Each structure stands twice: as C-alpha cells, then as structure tokens.
C-alpha cells in the first residue's frame, strides 16, 4: 500500500528475522564469557559476524525506503536506526584498519603487565594485582611504581594506535554526517521529529559545562578535605594547597575516589553503614544476596525475573575448572532470556551490585514490549541511571537496618549520617570532574582541539586544572594514558556516567517525592512504597520511541540536566565540608608536581 505500511512490513521482517540471530549471537557471547575455551572464542564472534553482516545487509536494504515521507515517529525512528550507516561506510581498507586498530588496543590494554625492573619474574596485570595495589596499599613507592608502570608498558604502545584511531574514527564519523566521534556520541542523544522534546548535539557540551560549573565548589571543598586526610595518610607527599597525585586516588587515574574513604572518614569512632562484614557474619551466600535484592525489588513493586535467570545464570564463580570473567554484567540474550553474570562474593558492594544489575534487567523487562532496536535505553544515559537508583536507595541506613543487617535500634544522628554522606560523596564527587575532563578531552582530541603532539601534556594539565590532579612523574607524548584507559580504547563514550550521576539524584528525589520522604534524601528507603517504583515505571518502558527528554520530564519534570538534586543530596554534607575546610586551603594548584618539587 503506502510506503509507511511497507516500511512497517519490511521492518517487522527485519526484527523477526533479527531476533533469532541476535539471540544466537548473545548466546555465543554468554557461552564465551562464562567458560573461556577456544571453541567459545571462535564461536562467539562467528554468531557475531553472521549478525554484523546481516545488519549492514538490511541497512542497505532499508535505506531505499523514504525517510522523510514517513508520518509515524515510531517507525521513522526505526528507519533512523537502520539508515544509520554505521562504521562500515569508508574505504574497505580503512574500515578494517579501524576495526583492527580497535582490536589491537583492546588486546594490548588488557594483556599488558608491569614487571619489577630487577626481577623479570614478578610481573603483574591489572585485575587483580594492580587494582589491589592502587587502592589500599600504603607504600608510596609501590603505588607510584604500579601507577607509572601500567602507563609505561602499554600506553607507549597504545599511543600510535590511538594516534591513527582518532583520524580514522573521526573520518568515519564525518562520513556519517557528524562533527567527530564525540558528535557521534551526541547524535545518540539527538532526537528528531518530536516538536519540543528534540535534542541538539551542542547541548551536551553546553549542559555538561552548565552542571560542572557548580560541581567545581562542591568538588573543591571535598578535594580539599580528602587532600587534608591524605596528608594525614601520606606525610610529606602531598602539598596542602596543591592537587593530589594520581597514584593516591584509589584507582589508576582519578575516576573513582571512594577508596579514599577508609583514610578520609569523618568520624572514626562510629559503627559504619557498610554492612559487608555484617553480611559475612550473618552467613550469606550468593543466593541469599540475590534473593534479598529480589525481595527489595518486590518491595518497590517490581516482579521477579524469568525462570531462565534462576535456572541458567552463573550466580557463583566456578573457579579454576570453569574459568569465567568476573565483571558483573547484565546479560540480555533475547527471547526473554535474562541473566546476570557475576562472580558473587559476600559484600555490600556486591549486594548493591546485585541491586544494580537486577535494576538493569528490570529496565530490560520494562522495555520487553518494545521492538528490537527500541529495546535499549531512551538514551545511553538512563540505563546506568536506572541501575544506580536501586543501589542508591538500597544503601541507606533504613534499608540495611531492616534487611536483617545493621541492628534496628540504630541511631540516625548526624555523625553516621555525614559518614555515609561522605562515603557516597567520594564516589559521586570524584567521578564528576574526571568524567567532565575525560569527555571534554575526547571531544577535544576527536574534534581536533588538542593537537596530536600535545595529548599527554594537555591531558595532565586538564587533570591539574579541571580534576585537580597532578602526575607524580612526568609524561611525554610517548605515553597515552587516555589510550591506557578502559572506556577510550574500546570505542565507547563516557558521558553516560556524567548524565547518570546527575539524573540519578534527580530520579532519587522524584522517587522519594513518591515515597513521601520528608527530610534530606539519604534517609529515604523506597522499600514498601510502590509509588516510587511506579513512578520509575512511568518512564521505564517507553524507550527510544519517545525522547529521553520526555522520559526525564515524566519523572522529574525537565528536558535537561541540572546541578540541583546532587547538591541537595550533598548540602548538609556541604555545610559539614564548610565546617571542615576552614583549616585547609580551599582549592588546588596546577603548578605542584611530585616530580618537579
């Protein structure tokens, strides 16, 4: 009949053929990342190559239809996904060269190890070993050695690959009618044809800088506080007015700073909200942790998973006989087959991670009615946000107080209140200028605002100015520690965690409005209050058929990111920070350096 109906007919042919193929592809990926065998690595991408040729095949077969003749937004947004030309639109030499550069970076970022300069037998890779030395070790030389050697073995090899990668990938993104590959990120946030809920691409840089300008004083006070407590931790190693060295920040770069909390604790003589030891001492296994998380998901109004989850998922690490990756990943294999792969230990971090990935699967089960490429987030930034909602609500003292942990005659006084505030605040506050700086850096490098012979120089100057982080030993352009970062070398964005961090507390204040919580946000447990889970479900199931501005306005009432709810979560803690930073310098200085002192 009309072109709209045969667009629907052909697109339904596409999804109904695509579903079994994507199901076999995701099964290939599951049976690879649950038992690493050579049959699994060969058959993993074979059902992936079968799928990737199918998609560019049907992309070529769908573009012949008229894009600007379809009235329905719902199937024109289907056409926007299939008429996305992808990364195969180049010269066939440079497309495979870009794919091989990405794979070479992915190999040498993960296979790389550090070695003792006098002993070529003590060699250590990233996870474990270096994520354990960089977090809780107290030796200055050992943290600096692991820190610098992780940059000195692989980042020197990762620099020419990223050097070619930026030009090849921005050539692809310009071929796809974008400014750069950062603009390719922002084009996912772009929505078209909705008349009021739409999105321009420069708004992301605009609005990230908008909220960042008021993260700057909050982050400034908390950075001054954790600088003073690292002065309590590391004598004669950190200047009080200056920045912080990146080998003392808990992680390899400066992204997560929650590991500082054990040495940046406010009140060292109060019972900690972290109930990991209470989870071990009350004798839980992996199954009881996931059942308790499922109990909270029932408490907020959300159902259980499919039977395939509790039937087939790897809820426990099998060990040496069956090796498996131990990243907690929410697997969405298609055909309603929903799993979580996690080498589960008995930890409140693992309990909140059970909440996190079960919230990811909950997001998936909400969009289970959507068609195929619509079965994703509205943006890339609400998937991790919805995952983090149940972890933020399931970390409160009221929550763990009546879980069975954290004895229920516990005082909600301001001491342990500001303790739990500052524990979550090291995370939330340390992740924002690193994400701002990293995405601004990649927008600079992908657009071309940093010249390619000054990546590492402007990198650490942005760490010193924006993040307030010095490098302890100097860095020429032989390195590329951004290419020695995880989310950069493997062709991914990172601004979804920035948007996550804002819209998280937005959604949390909106759900605690639904929960009818009265004080500040941290005491709010949304368990037994189905209004919060229902208000989450008001946005949880629409997906990409409507814009993420619409799903954001359904819950918190806006079309844009905002610095207010995070600051309202930190505001009594901000009064506490003002109470604490009177005896330290408020700020950071880019002229300090632990190699130039």
């Amino acid at each position: 009949s009309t072109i709209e109906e045969q667009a629907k007919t052909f697109l339904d042919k596409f999804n109904h053929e695509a579903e079994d193929l994507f199901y076999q592809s995701s099964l290939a990926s599951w049976n690879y990342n649950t038992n690493i065998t050579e049959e699994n690595v060969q058959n993993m991408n074979n059902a992936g190559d079968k799928w990737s040729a199918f998609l560019k095949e049907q992309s070529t077969l769908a573009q012949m239809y008229p894009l600007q003749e379809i009235q329905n937004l719902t199937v024109k947004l289907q056409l926007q996904a299939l008429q996305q030309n992808g990364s195969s639109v180049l010269s066939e030499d440079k497309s495979k060269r870009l794919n091989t550069i990405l794979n070479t970076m992915s190999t040498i970022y993960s296979t790389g190890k550090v070695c003792n300069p006098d002993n070529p037998q003590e060699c250590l890779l990233l996870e474990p070993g270096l994520n354990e030395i960089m977090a809780n070790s107290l030796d200055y030389n050992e943290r600096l050695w692991a820190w610098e050697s992780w940059r000195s073995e692989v980042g020197k090899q990762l620099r020419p690959l990223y050097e070619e990668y930026v030009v090849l990938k921005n050539e692809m993104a310009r071929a796809n009618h974008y400014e750069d590959y950062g603009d390719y990120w922002r084009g996912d946030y772009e929505v078209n044809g909705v008349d009021g809920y739409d999105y321009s691409r420069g708004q992301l840089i605009e609005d990230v800088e908008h909220t960042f300008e008021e993260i700057k004083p909050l982050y400034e006070h908390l950075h001054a506080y954790v600088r003073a407590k690292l002065m309590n931790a590391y004598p004669s190693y950190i200047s009080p007015i200056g920045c912080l060295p990146a080998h003392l920040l808990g992680d390899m770069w400066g992204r997560f700073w929650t590991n500082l909390y054990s040495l940046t604790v406010p009140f060292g003589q109060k019972p900690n909200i972290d109930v990991t030891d209470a989870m071990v001492d009350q004798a839980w296994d992996a199954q009881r942790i996931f059942k308790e998380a499922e109990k909270f998901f029932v408490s907020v109004g959300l159902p259980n998973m499919t039977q395939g989850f509790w039937e087939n998922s790897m809820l426990t690490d099998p060990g040496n006989v069956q090796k498996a990756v131990c990243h907690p990943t929410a697997w969405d294999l298609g055909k309603g087959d929903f799993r979580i792969l996690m080498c589960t230990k008995v930890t409140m971090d693992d309990f909140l991670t059970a909440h996190h990935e079960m919230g990811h699967i909950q997001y998936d089960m909400a969009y289970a009615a959507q068609p195929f490429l619509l079965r994703n987030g509205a943006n890339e930034g609400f998937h991790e946000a919805v995952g983090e909602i149940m972890s933020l609500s399931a970390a409160t003292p009221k929550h763990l107080k009546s879980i069975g942990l954290l004895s229920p005659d516990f005082q909600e006084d301001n001491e342990t209140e500001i303790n739990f505030l500052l524990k979550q605040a090291l995370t939330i506050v340390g992740t924002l200028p690193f994400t701002y700086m990293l995405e601004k850096w990649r927008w600079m490098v992908f657009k071309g605002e940093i010249p390619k012979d000054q990546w590492m120089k402007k990198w650490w100057e942005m760490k010193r100015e924006i993040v307030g982080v010095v490098e302890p030993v100097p860095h020429d352009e032989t390195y590329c520690d951004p290419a020695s970062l995880f989310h950069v070398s493997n062709d991914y964005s990172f601004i979804r965690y920035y948007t996550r961090t804002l819209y998280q507390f937005q959604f949390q204040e909106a759900l605690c409005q639904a929960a009818k919580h009265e004080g500040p946000l941290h005491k709010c447990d949304i368990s037994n209050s189905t209004e919060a889970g229902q208000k989450l479900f008001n946005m949880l199931r629409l997906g990409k058929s409507e814009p993420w501005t619409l799903a954001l306005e359904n819950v918190v009432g806006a079309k844009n990111m905002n610095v207010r709810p995070l600051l309202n979560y930190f505001e009594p803690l901000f009064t506490w920070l003002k109470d604490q930073n009177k005896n330290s310098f408020v700020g950071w200085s880019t002229d300090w350096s632990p190699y130039a002192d």
Binding site: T9, H16, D20, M64, T306, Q307, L333, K335, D337
Partner: protein, 92 residues
Amino acid sequence: NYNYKYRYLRHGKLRPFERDISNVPFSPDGKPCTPPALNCYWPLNDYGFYTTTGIGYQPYRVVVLSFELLNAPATVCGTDLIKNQCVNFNFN
C-alpha cells in the same frame, strides 16, 4: 526447535476454522513475487523455542476442543451403583 512454523502474512483474517496450508510468495497487495524481491518475503516463520528462554517462549501444545452442535445424534455426553435402596434407573 524451529520446526513449528507460524503463518503470519495473509490478506485478511481467517474464516471460521480456516486451515491455511498454501505457501505463496507474499507482497502486501498481491503482485507475484519470488524472494529476495523487495517487499516480497515469506508468510511463514520459525517460533524460536529454546528451553533456556522465558516462560511464554516455551512450546505449548494446544488442543482446541471445537464445538459443533447437534448436526447428528449424540456423540459425546456424560453415577455409582446403589444397593438395597429404592433406586431409579436408566441403564444401557
């Protein structure tokens, strides 16, 4: 087990008890095709049963117990013995 296929392309609904067997190349206004022609694909596809999947994607066998009413004498219709009591009958 993809071997139970569903017919999903036909012009219009099925009639009372219509048993559609004929497999024709389908285009949404007739127009005799042969695949892989444009808007010319099959009216049949595979279910996609694996036991690993969700509950509604598991294979269920359905009998329809179809009623047609009294077009011939009684075909299917449907009281233990009592002893030493004044009972009523209807034997064979």
